[PDB]
Amino acid sequence: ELRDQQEQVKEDMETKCFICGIGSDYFDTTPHGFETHTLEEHNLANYM
Amino acid sequence: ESILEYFRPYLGRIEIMGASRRIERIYFEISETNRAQWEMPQVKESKRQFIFDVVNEGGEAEKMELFVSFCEDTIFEMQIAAQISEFWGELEVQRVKFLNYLSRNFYTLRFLALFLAFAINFILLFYKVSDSPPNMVYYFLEESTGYMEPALWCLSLLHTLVAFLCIIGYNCLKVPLVIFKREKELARKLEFDGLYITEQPGDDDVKGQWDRLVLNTPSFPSNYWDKFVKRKVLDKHGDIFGRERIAELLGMDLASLEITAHNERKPDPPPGLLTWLMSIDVKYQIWKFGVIFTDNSFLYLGWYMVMSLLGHYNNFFFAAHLLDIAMGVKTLRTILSSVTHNGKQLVMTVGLLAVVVYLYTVVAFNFFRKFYNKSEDEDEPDMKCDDMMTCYLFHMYVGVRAGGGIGDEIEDPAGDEYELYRVVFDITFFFFVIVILLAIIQGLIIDAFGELRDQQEQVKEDMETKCFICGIGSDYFDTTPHGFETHTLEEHNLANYMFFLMYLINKDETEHTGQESYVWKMYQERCWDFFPAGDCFRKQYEDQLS
Amino acid sequence: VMSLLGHYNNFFFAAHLLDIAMGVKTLRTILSSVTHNGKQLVMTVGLLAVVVYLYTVVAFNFFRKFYNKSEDEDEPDMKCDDMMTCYLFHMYVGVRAGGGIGDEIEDPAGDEYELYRVVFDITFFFFVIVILLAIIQGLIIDAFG
């Protein structure tokens, strides 16, 4: 269960944006969509 | 209807996302030879693995790039198949016929080698030993028929001969595709990445350090179909980065490329094979030998032959060839992969087991030492915990294997001042070492096996739930009866895309229609946008019922 | 046929007790779970046979004096003097043993092959007992589940 919790943490991050929460399904309509949103649109560091 | 039924297995129709931002259907021609070259078990096996690795590793954006690379590899594979389909002049023609026989019968020779290994080891099951000839021991077969020893010798010789044939067949069959992929990836890196021009590979990229050899060799793009990659790299690198420097890096001459650009007549090679042996490219051949002497399948075959030759020193080295069944069938290979699937975790968990057992050794060395007299003899004691090394070996060997901990093999703690101390010590050893840690190792391998089998089943299930090209799931298609079937067989069929690629390749560039020229230019520029993603003809004209 | 054989010998009657397994649902499911992964089980027990045969070759060429099961000094019962007898001894006794073949072989102490036999017994207990047998258990129990 602990190892499954660790796997889930990594998976959840790649599925939903930490800030807006919107999942990767709305972003992957455009190619490399989630990557664009979670790196240029809403990157955690950028907020820092 | 009759014409449609006759040309149905020749009418391949794929849908492309065109320049009009619309999903448009392209109807091309599938050659009969092209379909026949798609439907042998080897190409099907290639597609099966490709689909497995793509669905397992993932990546929606890289999916089309890997699909196109697979199409190129499989085109070259059926080119190999076409070449291998069905006094020096006689010698070379007989040599190519013999290599052809080996290349077509590679798998049959593999099965024959495994059969010979099984037969040899079945004979070896009759081996016995005796102090007398069939301080000195003699290992001889005990057989009443008297034929199993000549049969053993004959089968050993035949098995090493088949080992020769299998390595030659691999060299003539699977090695060319490996070279083709290596040359292709090096050409793509030079054309697009420009690594040897700008981003020099580091020490970790031993593949790049070895690829540096064929940078200047004239036979650089030999196995790869494109022969002008050097000129392309000069066109997009050297204007900015130094044309003479790039020419030196690629081992080609500016005047030579000028005279090839101008009108020129190609001469004929000198007659004879003694010129050829002097015309072999030493550097390119060394690079090819380096990239096939590290290919894992060829290394397995070389190890197979090394074991076969050692089987002539001692016949029991032929027992190593029984692992070929594990390398052959699928889920036994999965059992072997499950050992290393969590290999890092297993190594450090057995390290934790070693550490905790060492702690039990220190506390059973300082205390609890008189309870390790394994010898029942009173005159001769065999205290296993008088030395730290011997006590640690005793623990890690015997106590771990014991199901009730070290208390099974230590003296009973009764009538002694340390009674509850040893009770707690044995209980904690049986709990942590046996009950917990060993079962964690069991979990780390068995759950790895289950996870690998679940990955295979998930690959098979995912394919039937979403279209590999547009991705749209089966829920949108199953509204119409047999919907997904129709969409993934007549609308977007992986093969149909491969057949379009071949049709573009073998069609003259002056005949390609607007759609075909668009797809061809897209393929040249490596954009992969012509694949429909997230939409299809049905989705575009849902209101128009088409 | 079993009923008629029950008149030759009454103990052929049992054969008719399996009718309860054919009758109730999940006992029939226990019997179906044996063959639900039958191909995998056959080839995994084949792998078990192969690896045990490898342990037999390496305990036949080496580690042969450690198979004297007889406690009598005058009469030895070396189980690994013949390849067939050693393979039978392994697949029969060592697989059933929970601590591998080291339970039923002589202790490797005070011998030049000490760490060799330690590694041999550990790898036998690990691959044959810990892993492969539990994989067979998984292949049937997960089939039931």
Ligand SMILES: Nc1ncnc2c1ncn2[C@@H]1O[C@H](COP(=O)(O)OP(=O)(O)OP(=O)(O)O)[C@@H](O)[C@H]1O
């Ligand atoms: N708002 C967000 N900002 C950053 N990453 C996000 C966000 N939402 C989701 N993610 C996911 O988090 C991933 C973080 O990967 P990245 O390579 O940026 O860091 P990392 O290597 O995981 O960081 P660290 O080394 O600190 O663990 C992204 O690739 C993306 O899938």
Ligand SMILES: Nc1ncnc2c1ncn2[C@@H]1O[C@H](COP(=O)(O)OP(=O)(O)OP(=O)(O)O)[C@@H](O)[C@H]1O
């Ligand atoms: N675009 C697609 N092209 C082909 N198959 C698709 C596609 N999208 C989803 N699929 C699924 O892939 C399945 C492939 O089954 P098919 O019988 O065509 O080949 P196969 O026998 O699995 O091939 P192989 O023998 O190479 O493994 C289809 O039945 C379908 O469910």
Ligand SMILES: [Ca+2]
């Ligand atoms: Ca035209």
Ligand SMILES: [Zn+2]
């Ligand atoms: Zn966001």
Ligand SMILES: [Zn+2]
């Ligand atoms: Zn589709």
